Design an enzyme around this catalytic site. Structure first.
Site, mmCIF file in Angstrom:
data_model
loop_
_atom_site.group_PDB
_atom_site.id
_atom_site.type_symbol
_atom_site.label_atom_id
_atom_site.label_comp_id
_atom_site.label_asym_id
_atom_site.label_seq_id
_atom_site.Cartn_x
_atom_site.Cartn_y
_atom_site.Cartn_z
ATOM 1 N N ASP A 329 0.744 -1.272 0.002
ATOM 2 C CA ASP A 329 0.011 0.091 -0.073
ATOM 3 C C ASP A 329 0.759 1.410 0.012
ATOM 4 O O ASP A 329 0.302 2.342 -0.205
ATOM 5 C CB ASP A 329 -1.016 -0.158 1.119
ATOM 6 C CG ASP A 329 -1.994 -1.034 0.988
ATOM 7 O OD1 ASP A 329 -2.562 -1.181 -0.146
ATOM 8 O OD2 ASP A 329 -2.510 -1.836 1.919
ATOM 9 N N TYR A 414 -10.401 -0.674 2.128
ATOM 10 C CA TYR A 414 -9.848 -0.724 3.459
ATOM 11 C C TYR A 414 -9.551 0.577 4.325
ATOM 12 O O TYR A 414 -8.926 1.500 3.578
ATOM 13 C CB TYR A 414 -8.427 -1.686 3.396
#
Ligand SMILES: *[C@@H]1O[C@H](CO)[C@@H](O[C@@H]2O[C@H](CO)[C@@H](O)[C@H](O)[C@H]2NC(C)=O)[C@H](O)[C@H]1NC(C)=O
Ligand SMILES: *[C@@H]1O[C@H](CO)[C@@H](O[C@@H]2O[C@H](CO)[C@@H](O)[C@H](O)[C@H]2NC(C)=O)[C@H](O)[C@H]1NC(C)=O
Ligand SMILES: *[C@@H]1O[C@H](CO)[C@@H](O)[C@H](O)[C@H]1NC(C)=O
Ligand SMILES: *[C@@H]1O[C@H](CO)[C@@H](O)[C@H](O)[C@H]1NC(C)=O
Ligand SMILES: [Ca+2]
Ligand SMILES: [Ca+2]
Ligand SMILES: [Ca+2]
Ligand SMILES: [Ca+2]
Ligand SMILES: [Cu+2]
Ligand SMILES: [Cu+2]
EC number: 1.4.3.21
Lengths: 699, 704
Positions: A329, A414
């Site tokens: 990420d 998320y």
């Protein structure tokens, strides 16, 4: 004394004008850029070197030059590179150096470049205009096709199979209004090849529908019209949870609210939080995300730096998108994808909230409102307590109040919550929760070696999360060593009755001399007491230590055998301690996501068999879990039980519990009036008058 | 079925059982608070929990409730062969019968030396120590210790070396005023033999002063006056931390306080707590300690029982006291030694506080004021949250507020905090903190294989803390199995480019069929998803589960090789799942502490190779850590990082997250006014909806 403050908006505009005027004309705004353009992708604070910083903070020397680091996509040329340029000093930049080669030993291949917002948009033009109508028949019959307004795309992971690829699997989902699209996969998945600098040249390498692989959409629609593909009609709206976030239940009496009876007991000035006990600076890196510097308990420094390095997410599945997916990420950006904290939900209503300014994929500096929150929280627990009914009658304890800094990074589905919590005992807790939506697949077939049915037509794909933290403790100065204390039982004869045996408990100290001894792999066990320490000692003559104590339910790491695994070699460790070098500032990089096979930074390189006996050390902590999604993740994954991180805990660092000297302490004897105000502070308008609620808004 | 079956005895009920026992136990029945070994004695009277069959029959199917009975422990010391006996007495409130379940339960009489040491017994020992024995060493004791009113005694652990012994090592400490004496060991330790029923006949088996063993205090004083002992002057007063609890810093501005803007959102009636989401009953066992029963989320029962079963503390050290010491604190009593919660310290200031009644080592019921506290706590965290800047513009979250029950057991030096916390997601968290003072030794010699110097003259002795919990889940009914879910990687060829390899992630489900398979030892690794489950399934077809998720940094258990280890066999496990039997109510016993060699209950007995496929199951969770004491434990050990326990978490039990339907949830679109009150409940807390209460005037539950 604000060395570590993310860049102001002025400071950003300033670096941006400087770069404009000196990068050649034909310099295109990043938000509109095509692959073959030149481009400022990022401008952000370049942290100073530690030497010079401490020089200034401890020994009064002048501050080091405040510089910025700009990432520039150089697409307009024979050999396109990416380049990192340092630009300083601030606020009046006069110089610009190209550190690219001095840092990564060579040019940055252009395919490591993060996918631009324009690039995603260009891919969706190809998908919905040129490609998808070739299958308009199937898509009418399965998913209410309209000319691609009802459907929507989502990225994956590493892009391809091999260094230099740039082929991304994309799922299709209904474009649900006002709630997460991630649960409504339609069953179609497209491997798009978009390596070329000319978007016209982009192909569609593979297709996946409902269990089967095809070579184009035209071939799939051949097979549908030929009546050879059993199609199911997937509903399109629905109710509750799988479709909404809005509760149907009306609001009840109100939840408990916390306020500060006689004003706040901390202040935020710029990047610096200060309180009775704790002083520290704070920020977000654009890609690394949260960080705090110059953490000083009662004015003594404990840590130079604690900073998120990387978050990872390894999936498996039925479908090609899921089974390929390994998100790194940082390659999107934990700071870029920070989002506004919603007051009274993400943090106490009465927290102080601060903005974050950034310059990313634009030429304007923009600002994310309420990005950080800082607040004192009464825990409800006592920090400590004793009630003596024995021999002498007294009571002495202290309710724990805690100081907290929070950001939240929304990476697509998320929502990562990052917490830095500051205990009055001298301990620092770091924490990481994952909420938000799950990434999901379309239910078909062999499900169950791969996850759980979690709604109609929705498979909750199995996955791991891991995150990586850098802990640069400077325990009573720079020169630290690492100790590993533990325990053992030793059969022995009872001294005063030797015909009898007794299992004799014993502490166990070994001093770890070498990097390799302090590198601890996931799977292997680890010393119960493990701490960094000083030459120096406390009153009682034990070495002054801060102890790392972890909180991780590790997933099994991606096996070494995989070519990919180097882009996150930190995943294989629980903990590692390392000589802290300026050449080794970070554990991952924004360029690993889009090429893990040739890693732009490989963490296992830092562990290289040097000494860690009396050196400036840095611990690296991995934390994370396994997630088999389940019905109670719909609509969102909940925080309960999923907190991971670690504690940094005093270990003969002080001469006694510093909370002994707490202002909020309480004591009284049996022979005192426990309810008289001169003995007990607890025995003493229209209380909280609240700011009108505001919101940081949207893109 | 509307009855409170699980309620600790009221005081009327206790007096009633006392009166009944008095009348029917033979005359020559002495008050336990003043009793000598050879007397008869009511040691304890407390609620006898009902059998599960009958209880559920009532609670679920409406049948009449089972007879409410009490259990009295009686020390029968006045006889040829003295026993301990457990007697059931009922029904209440007007008892008419009494049976002696002793044999029916433990297959035989209860050996008299298993009996816990009476308060009178400790006093008689101190009479022998200070009046008869200690003056024989009056020379030494002037020289070192400012000499028997200034010194004070503290017990240890198992008492002896062998089944049937009753010889206790006792530390001597300065009798510090208004702070912990535990830190000022003077270096003297006496092995007292008190097995005899005549206190006159008690001896002093051995002596230990500052590194050396001696046969009596007389021979210690021979060697002292002969100038043959190097004696160390230990200070007697001192300042800060090692000596005080009282902070020298003056009160500063006030810490955060939490209140309920429009009334509380739960009620306590007797033993029964009730809220919008959670309904449950609660209590203290006198020796077991905390327990909750009949826990129901949104009206459906998840657990029949969760109850502390034992706490353990295994020490090591330089000195004989320390190296022998293995506390099995049930043998003192987690309920007996409960202490008043001090409001605004031990729980939030505005928590509701409840008393606890008991009849132990007396003939009058006494009461511990503010023994429990129940409260809702806003946690600061979101339970859940998502901010969508992508494709559609919305926000949807919920601040986590939580419901909490708390007792605190002060076992001499240690204050155990027991928490049971009730999350709005359907999860149940069980928690266990240890604060209070450390048990310390006099600093001498080869210290450091054995702990850390922690003040002048004070060794912080190394030790392990372990606690055991019983978790009787009834997941969607009585018939449960256990599943072990986990994960695996499988090398494979990428389907669309077979030339190329990919590490294929997969779920792993095995259904554990036998007790032994679900018994997991400390040290072994253990499935990442472990859950009890139903034949029944959720909407999407997966078995309805509650999943156990632990939080333990377990010490190494006492090695099996020791004769003692049977008294706490549960230490050796992380987790065990077991056929739940009435004959197997509890994991430990009050009678193990003073005789672990011939254990009154041996937990390993329960794990005995039956099926756990589709039966009424009960999980047993051990939790614990290692403690090398350190400067920051002076004056007290702190809570931070030392929370241990477990989560009980839904796992395809529901069809969706139940918090979706929360009243406190929050949602709004980009296209809405986020700060308008008809859109967002939070945009009204200011306008009108504040107003902190006038607070109750502070009170305290007091002391003995
Ligand atoms: C990456 O590309 C940039 C330009 O697109 C290169 O930088 C230029 O290099 C030439 C000589 O090579 C100079 O005359 C320019 O003045 C430079 N501009 C800047 C801002 O550096 C850079 O050399 C390339 N990097 C590598 C290693 O190939
Ligand atoms: C334990 O002790 C008690 C008496 O101290 C025994 O109980 C008595 O037994 C006699 C003869 O068995 C009866 O007639 C008494 O009335 C009994 N008293 C009560 C209230 O039970 C008891 O049987 C002993 N138990 C064992 C197994 O030794
Ligand atoms: C998707 O839906 C939203 C609202 O539900 C709309 O505003 C948006 O423009 C739609 N189209 C896409 C593909 O983004
Ligand atoms: C111990 O100290 C207290 C003073 O708090 C006192 O009341 C008591 O008499 C002392 N002596 C003993 C042996 O308890
Ligand atoms: Ca290195
Ligand atoms: Ca360091
Ligand atoms: Ca059994
Ligand atoms: Ca059960
Ligand atoms: Cu997850
Ligand atoms: Cu301890």
């Amino acid at each position: 004394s604000q060395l570590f403050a993310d860049l102001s908006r002025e400071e950003l505009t300033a670096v941006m004008r400087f770069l404009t005027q000196r990068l050649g004309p034909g310099l295109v705004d990043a938000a509109q850029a095509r692959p073959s353009d030149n481009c400022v992708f990022s401008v952000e604070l370049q942290l100073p070197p530690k030497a010079a910083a401490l020089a200034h903070l401890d020994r009064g020397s002048p501050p080091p030059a405040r510089e910025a680091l700009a990432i520039v996509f150089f697409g307009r040329q024979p050999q396109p590179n990416v380049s990192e340029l340092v630009v300083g000093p601030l606020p009046h930049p006069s110089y610009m150096r190209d550190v690219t080669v001095e840092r990564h030993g060579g040019p940055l291949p252009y395919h490591r470049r993060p996918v631009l917002f324009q690039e995603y948009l260009d891919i969706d033009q190809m998908i919905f205009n040129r490609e998808l109508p070739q299958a308009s028949g199937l898509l009418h019959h399965c998913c209410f096709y309209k000319r691609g307004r009802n459907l929507v795309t989502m990225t994956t992971a590493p892009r391809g199979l091999q260094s230099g690829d740039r082929a991304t699997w994309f799922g299709l989902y209904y474009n649900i209004s006002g709630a997460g699209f991630f649960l409504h996969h339609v069953g179609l998945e497209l491997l798009v090849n978009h390596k070329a600098l000319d978007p016209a040249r982009w192909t569609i390498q593979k297709v996946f529908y409902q269990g089967r692989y095809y070579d184009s959409l035209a071939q799939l629609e051949a097979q549908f019209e030929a009546g050879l593909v059993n199609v199911v009609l997937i509903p399109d709206n629905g109710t509750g949870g799988s479709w909404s976030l809005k509760s149907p239940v009306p609001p009840g009496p109100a939840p408990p609210l916390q306020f500060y009876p006689q004003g706040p007991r901390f202040s935020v000035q710029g990047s610096r939080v200060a309180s009775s006990l704790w002083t520290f600076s704070f920020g977000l890196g654009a890609f690394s995300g949260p960080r705090i510097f110059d953490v000083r308990f009662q004015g003594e420094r404990l840590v130079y730096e604690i900073s998120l390095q990387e978050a990872l997410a390894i999936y498996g599945g039925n479908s090609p998108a899921a089974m390929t997916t390994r998100y790194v990420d940082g390659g999107f950006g934990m700071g870029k994808y920070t989002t506004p904290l919603t007051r009274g939900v993400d943090c106490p209503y009465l927290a102080t909230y601060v903005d974050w300014h950034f310059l990313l994929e634009s030429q304007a500096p923009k600002t994310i409102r309420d990005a950080f929150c800082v607040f004192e929280q009464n825990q409800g627990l006592p920090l400590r307590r004793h009630h003596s009914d024995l021999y002498s009658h007294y009571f002495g304890g202290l309710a724990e109040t805690v100081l907290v800094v929070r950001s939240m990074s929304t990476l697509l589905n998320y929502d990562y919550v990052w917490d830095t919590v500051f205990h009055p005992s001298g301990a620092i807790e770091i924490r990481f929760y994952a909420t938000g939506y799950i990434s999901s697949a379309f239910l078909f077939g062999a499900t169950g070696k791969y996850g759980n049915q979690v709604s109609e037509h929705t498979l909750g794909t199995v996955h791991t999360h891991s995150a990586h933290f850098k802990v640069d403790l400077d325990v009573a100065g720079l020169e630290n060593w690492v100790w590993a204390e533990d325990m053992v039982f030793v059969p022995m004869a009872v001294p005063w009755s030797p015909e009898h045996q007794l299992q004799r408990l014993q502490v166990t100290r070994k001093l770890l001399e070498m990097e390799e001894q302090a590198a601890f792999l996931v799977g292997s066990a680890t010393p119960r007491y493990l701490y960094l320490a000083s030459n120096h000692s406390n009153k009682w003559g034990h070495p002054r230590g801060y102890r790392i104590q972890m909180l991780s339910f590790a997933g099994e790491p991606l096996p070494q055998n995989s070519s990919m695994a180097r882009g996150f070699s930190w995943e294989r460790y629980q903990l590692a301690v390392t000589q802290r070098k300026e050449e080794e500032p970070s554990s991952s990089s924004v360029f690993n996501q889009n090429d893990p096979w040739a890693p732009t930074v490989d963490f296992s390189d830092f562990i290289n068999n040097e000494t860690i006996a009396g050196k400036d050390l840095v611990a690296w902590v991995t934390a994370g879990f396994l997630h088999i999604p389940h019905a109670e993740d719909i609509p969102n994954t909940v925080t309960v039980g999923n907190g991971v991180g670690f504690f940094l805990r005093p270990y003969n660092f002080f001469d006694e519990d510093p909370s002994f000297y707490s202002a909020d302490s309480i004591y009284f004897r049996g022979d005192q009036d426990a309810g008289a105000c001169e003995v007990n502070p607890l025995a003493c308008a229209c209380a909280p008058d609240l700011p009108a609620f505001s919101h940081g808004g949207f893109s």
